[PDB]
Design an enzyme around this catalytic site. Structure first.
Site, PDB file in Angstrom:
ATOM      1  CG  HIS A 122      44.400  46.199  48.445  1.00  0.00           C
ATOM      2  ND1 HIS A 122      45.485  46.801  48.264  1.00  0.00           N
ATOM      3  CD2 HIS A 122      44.066  45.394  49.317  1.00  0.00           C
ATOM      4  CE1 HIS A 122      46.161  46.339  49.405  1.00  0.00           C
ATOM      5  NE2 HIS A 122      45.636  45.320  49.923  1.00  0.00           N
ATOM      6  CG  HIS A 173      36.202  43.278  43.899  1.00  0.00           C
ATOM      7  ND1 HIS A 173      36.189  41.836  44.102  1.00  0.00           N
ATOM      8  CD2 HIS A 173      37.203  43.250  42.741  1.00  0.00           C
ATOM      9  CE1 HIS A 173      36.990  41.238  43.295  1.00  0.00           C
ATOM     10  NE2 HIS A 173      37.670  42.015  42.547  1.00  0.00           N
ATOM     11  CG  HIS A 213      39.916  45.522  39.462  1.00  0.00           C
ATOM     12  ND1 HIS A 213      40.999  45.344  40.222  1.00  0.00           N
ATOM     13  CD2 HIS A 213      38.996  44.215  39.487  1.00  0.00           C
ATOM     14  CE1 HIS A 213      40.542  44.161  40.973  1.00  0.00           C
ATOM     15  NE2 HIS A 213      39.647  43.610  40.451  1.00  0.00           N
ATOM     16  CD  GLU A 264      42.049  43.342  37.664  1.00  0.00           C
ATOM     17  OE1 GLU A 264      41.387  42.320  38.036  1.00  0.00           O
ATOM     18  OE2 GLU A 264      42.792  43.835  38.472  1.00  0.00           O
ATOM     19  CG  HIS A 320      36.538  40.909  38.773  1.00  0.00           C
ATOM     20  ND1 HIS A 320      37.897  41.148  39.069  1.00  0.00           N
ATOM     21  CD2 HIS A 320      36.270  41.075  37.709  1.00  0.00           C
ATOM     22  CE1 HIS A 320      38.697  41.363  37.822  1.00  0.00           C
ATOM     23  NE2 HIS A 320      37.715  41.296  37.133  1.00  0.00           N
ATOM     24  CB  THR A 327      43.288  39.963  39.107  1.00  0.00           C
ATOM     25  OG1 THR A 327      42.146  40.610  39.749  1.00  0.00           O
ATOM     26  CG2 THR A 327      42.432  39.328  38.170  1.00  0.00           C
ATOM     27  CB  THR A 328      44.060  40.995  44.228  1.00  0.00           C
ATOM     28  OG1 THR A 328      43.037  40.236  44.824  1.00  0.00           O
ATOM     29  CG2 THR A 328      43.373  42.278  43.594  1.00  0.00           C
TER      30      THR A 328
HETATM   31 ZN   LIG Z   1      38.734  41.714  41.056  1.00  0.00          ZN
END
Ligand SMILES: [Zn+2]
Ligand SMILES: O=C(O)c1ccccc1[S@@](=O)Cc1ccccc1
Length: 257
Positions: A61, A91, A93, A103, A116, A195-196
């Site tokens: 992901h 991590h 995005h 995000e 994040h 958010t996942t």
């Molecule tokens: Zn995140």
């Protein structure tokens, strides 16, 4: 299972994770004119001098840089937080193009990526217990824009060739996350979620107003990663971001005037 494709992306998540349509989902658009300065916020403290990174992993992901959270080393406190939150991993995005990737959005503006740094509330003992609590996590979110290179990000960029596919990991010790922060700690804060999937509603979000600049070459290397495992058809790891969700009954507070 879940992902970011047409068939398993954000619009499908609610079927396995109904909380996707919950009351405090993230990310959200940050309307700067509606956010209000909050005098009750205490000074924010990011104490990462003792951080102990361990490994970097492509989880299919995104990629996670993991830390040793067996002791109070890298912690976040102050601001809207009560107590001490321990850094467990960070991590990003990002998008397929520089015009998208973040995000959270700021007055609907999408940045090229978003970092994040995930922390858990030490009063709960471990991360697993913390994610069963409404104040179990604190995530420091930092926007990335494309411009000058971020020196402190280059070690991450250079190890990505080693974890190209899902399931691959590499040693990643002695990495200093202080090198990923902008100069200013001004921020917006609101209660939200991961958010996942599982999209758990345990997060106090602290989103820094100042983005960090990274070079086009640095983000381009993020876009060479794969969502797939080794020996499977190549699907580039891009656009692994969930779009803005309904703010519902929430107020975003600003740490600055
Ligand atoms: Zn995140
Ligand atoms: O999953 C996504 O996020 C995804 C996003 C965009 C396009 C397609 C996919 S999945 O088909 C890729 C995939 C994942 C894991 C193993 C093998 C293949």
């Amino acid at each position: 299972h879940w992902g970011y494709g047409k068939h398993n992306g954000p619009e499908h998540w609610h079927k396995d994770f109904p909380i996707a349509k919950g009351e405090r989902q993230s990310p959200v658009d940050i309307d700067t004119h509606t956010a209000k300065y909050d005098p009750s916020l205490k000074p924010l403290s990011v104490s990462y001098d003792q951080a102990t990174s361990l490994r970097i992993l492509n989880n299919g992901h995104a990629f996670n840089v993991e830390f040793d959270d067996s002791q109070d080393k890298a912690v976040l406190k102050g601001g809207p937080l009560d107590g001490t939150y321990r850094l467990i991993q960070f991590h990003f995005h990002w998008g397929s193009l520089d015009g998208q990737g973040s995000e959270h959005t700021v007055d609907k503006k999408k940045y090229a990526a978003e970092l994040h740094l995930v922390h858990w509330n030490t009063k709960y003992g471990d991360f697993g217990k913390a994610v069963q609590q409404p104040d179990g996590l604190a995530v420091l979110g930092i926007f990335l824009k494309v411009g000058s290179a971020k020196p402190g990000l280059q070690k991450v960029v250079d190890v990505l060739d080693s974890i190209k596919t899902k399931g691959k990991s590499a040693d990643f010790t002695n990495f200093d996350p202080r090198g990923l922060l902008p100069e200013s700690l001004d921020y917006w804060t609101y209660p939200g979620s991961l958010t996942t999937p599982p999209l758990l509603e345990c997060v106090t979000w602290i989103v820094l107003k100042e983005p960090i600049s990274v070079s086009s070459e640095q983000v381009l290397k993020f876009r060479k990663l794969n969502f797939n495992g080794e020996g499977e058809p190549e699907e580039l790891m891009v656009d692994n971001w969930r779009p803005a969700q309904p703010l519902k009954n929430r107020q975003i507070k600003a740490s600055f005037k």
